[PDB]
């Protein structure tokens, strides 16, 4: 569970990330695609070339979703209701991908903000991303 | 029973005049549910303990879950009454509540409330500090806006003409974060008469301390420095006698029109300037939030912050 | 498999790493983020708080050893399967570390490599690094 | 009864025989417990997979593949749900042929006395998801302490009195909580069940009789360490229907 | 089952009835076997079966089914997994 100190760490880290969140999300999407090709099956109608604006916008959307989740860390299931229903029944995204994406997102932060990515902040971000993934994948059926 | 044998106590609080409400009946300690609990109940309670002027009332898990039976629920009380057990109620020991609905109260007698500013340019500019139960703390900036700054400036008694948010030139505080999510409407006599999140569970950190800058309006100046003319360059702000720059978190031509209009230099064209001269370095900055574009001055722009963040 | 460009990139980048710090940091990150892995390292004493594991010399020594194994694997990219066979038997027989924990080590190791390299960790070389960590994880599995 | 070969996240190496693995026709893994030579226990939610709940159990039975021991296949003959499945997710499954009890296939027999006392330490093993949300290749087993019922009700529903309940499950989905359930907290190292371990027995080791007793069947595995409590159905509250169903078949 | 807003009586948007009202079907998971069983059920030739609504308009009201899988053996649509 997210302990109150854990919440403070997550809040501070996502405040420090700043407006670069959209770029980081796009980079995370591209990195997940490149590392594990199998995750591209869920984007058949997507221009996945280098510098594509489509994946840029998708990463911006994911980053905005995560920022909204952080703002509502105490009531996360309600914040991600629509996205949970979209990823659970409509798209039927497998749970594994989520963890993959999380790791990718994490590494992106480590690549751009080494100073603030202390081990405690690492634990906090991992717990928060695990909670988000579990909420989005909960109703998988 | 006429109520003489009954006794009441506040437990698990900062001191005797604050905490969870408990009462003794039939030799058993118990709590009171927060159903239909308001400031009238709080005054009734801080009329009987000799602690006066009930500051705040709570509910649920503010002070921790209690133990024992529950005596009262769904009470209706007036603002002036001798004791809590004289109010109209369904019956002793009759309730639909559980210990996740216990009630707590904070009175003024233990709460020696006071407000101050520290570590700023002028007597009434800088970081806000609130005294609670003998300990000084700060206020989280989340939800801190111009109306709250107006209330604070009026509370301390210095000009209310221009009241901005932001801890100018002030460093991060140490200690407690007593207040958060203050929601003053702009006319309350003190910052703690407004609605605000509980005093316990805050996730802010000390990089987020709140502050205010109050001024008559005769000490704020705005200039363009660096360039061949008064109408082009980097925008610099001299507030009180402190010099600083503006951060471009959301800088666009929309706010450049307001700034150019203020200086009387026409309309904004480009967000850059030929490097004619050199400008000195400064550490305090000003941050803006989405000016509409038709404002007659940059000071009228909604919720502008004077320091307290970084432009990394 | 690794294409010649990926091989060149991965070898060149690994040539810039330091043995004595990055492996220990990766191990400490695994201990702090996934608590159930402390059971195996109980021998190293106090692992209760992050600063303790970061400040433990034994953690740094074991990080050095695992990084040496990783460098050996890099030197035997073609024959990873036989390179780590002894270690596979060791972890399968005496310790009962599940195959997933190896991949956990690989991900934290990649994280700290990103931490150290900064901008230099371009996604194309990260793909190769993911492939090599996957290879070593599979080789150690059973 | 109750003699495993070896009493003892950590990879099992000869300790949990009663466990059984199930996969639906659309490749989702779930767990089950051996109760006797020919009968099993499982959660009802593991039976309404990839089809509407209006279907009959006869339609469910042939669409589920079942493994026991070391990847030993078995065939399902019948599936019978509890008449009040909407509030208790017990579901029993009958094997095509009675299994030959051996070290790798051996049941877990049921409590004669309740063991869901706060602080009691029990064992839970399952084929569910892991830290990377991939189904575990090797059987996993964890140790959990029983947790207070009132705290669990507060965690998932807020208040104990029915009129004042409102949903507050941290993982979105809400479990079935009533007098037929009990909850368990995380382990010492913050280990908790996740997707796919439903149906796994909450085993308690009684030293006086040196016997393992199945104390509950996990009915909420969506906690995945995000929620603080996992939810189980009490076997003692289900003993009678189990006995009646076994006798009737 | 009915076909509406199509070129002939044998092609168009597919509708299903329940509780006394008609409703539409989602195309996701709708494969050639589903169209084959839909054609077979109705009194229409079944030599060639294709997916898609031809020059038809958008739907109205509720969507009363999604992600079906008939496999081609079930005589009628509602006998399939849904
Ligand atoms: C932290 C985890 C994730 C978050 C916060 C997230 C968030 C979002 C958001 C905000 C949208 C846009 C919805 C809309 O515009 O209506 C979306 C759509 C989508 N997501 Fe995710 N997502 C996550 C994980 C994943 C993963 C792991 C995958 C696949 C491997 C995935 C695949 C998709 C797809 C295919 C769409 C539809 C895009 C489209 O139709 O244009 N998502 N997600
Ligand atoms: C995935 C890549 C891994 C590599 C390359 C690796 C390599 C090694 C090597 C070379 C040793 C020998 C140390 C010695 O002889 O003193 C060792 C020992 C050991 N490893 Fe691993 N290992 C890996 C994964 C893991 C994981 C994931 C864990 C636990 C989570 C683990 C736990 C241990 C333990 C407990 C020892 C013995 C330490 C002691 O008792 O002194 N290993 N490993
Ligand atoms: C998409 O395509 C179909 C196939 O053409 C359209 O159906 C046709 O719609 C036209 C209107 O443009 C109908 O024409 C009318 O026919 C009657 C025949 O008695 C006549 O009285 C009218 O003067 C007019 O010509 C036509 O009957 C109808 N069907 C056929 C077989 O051609 C359909 O409207 C299109 N749109 C949708 C939403 O489906
Ligand atoms: C930041 O704050 C310090 C606080 O000390 C400012 O110095 C104060 O200036 C006012 C106005 O003249 C005086 O009343 C105080 O006595 C001063 N304090 C001193 C001199 O210790 C200072 O000007 C500010 N510094 C910067 C760099 O912004
Ligand atoms: C400035 O523009 C806004 C947006 O239309 C408008 O509401 C406001 O009244 C304007 N202010 C003045 C002083 O005209
Ligand atoms: C199901 O619940 C009903 C509620 O009235 C009860 O009468 C019945 O005995 C229950 N059945 C079982 C098998 O517990
Ligand atoms: Ca209430
Ligand atoms: Ca009440
Ligand atoms: Ca803030
Ligand atoms: Ca406010």
Residue numbers in the entry:
A (entry chain D): 2 to 142
B (entry chain A): 152 to 463
C (entry chain E): 3 to 144
D (entry chain F): 90 to 97, 107 to 347
E (entry chain C): 266 to 347
Passage from the reporting paper:
CD163 is an archetypal scavenger receptor and mediates detoxification of free haemoglobin. Detoxification involves haemoglobin binding to the abundant serum protein haptoglobin, followed by CD163-mediated uptake of stoichiometrically diverse haptoglobin-haemoglobin complexes into macrophages for degradation. CD163 contains an ectodomain consisting of nine scavenger receptor cysteine-rich (SRCR) domains linked to a C-terminal transmembrane helix13. The CD163 ectodomain adopts an architecture consisting of a ‘base’, formed from SRCR domains 5–9, linked to a four-domain ‘arm’ (SRCR1-4), of which two or three domains were ordered.
